[PDB]
Amino acid sequence: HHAPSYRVKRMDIAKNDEECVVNAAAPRGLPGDGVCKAVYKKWPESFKNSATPVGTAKTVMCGTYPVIHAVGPNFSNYSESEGDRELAAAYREVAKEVTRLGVNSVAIPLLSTGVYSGGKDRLTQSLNHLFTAMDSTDADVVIYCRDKEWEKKISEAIQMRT
């Protein structure tokens, strides 16, 4: 009867202490410069056939460690309304994969808030879609970020719901 939790840590997600990781991935499965740079350095084997459409997630094992490649929309290319829909959908697929995998915990970044943000601050938009998808799972969720002001805002959002 474990109590599922949310936490946020400001550090490289490749150093996570959870049972699986979510990559903020690209649709063609190519290595990138954000989270995906770290994921490719740490779990390169998980990039075999990791390509998957925008708005979806695809899990590839590195050994027995699952890497869930979730592809948020690039808001430079999508309208605000369609990009919002694809971002929500990518997180829904993450929740389904976390559940299917049976893991007790997952390390997760904020999708579409960096390289794919279209130059806008999307912390709240992305975090709220994360909660909408993950709230109904019972895995411990650890959100990884790099910006010190974002850490505070994410922490505040978590705490105000408890």
Ligand SMILES: Nc1ncnc2c1ncn2[C@@H]1O[C@H](COP(=O)(O)OP(=O)(O)OC[C@H]2O[C@@H](O)[C@H](O)[C@@H]2O)[C@@H](O)[C@H]1O
């Ligand atoms: N190693 C990291 N650990 C934790 N957070 C990180 C890390 N690297 C970046 N971040 C932060 O994670 C959030 C998501 O940013 P991106 O990784 O750039 O993801 P996204 O906006 O979804 O862009 C995906 C695209 O970037 C490429 O890396 C990827 O291959 C894809 O083409 C941002 O707030 C970013 O500052």
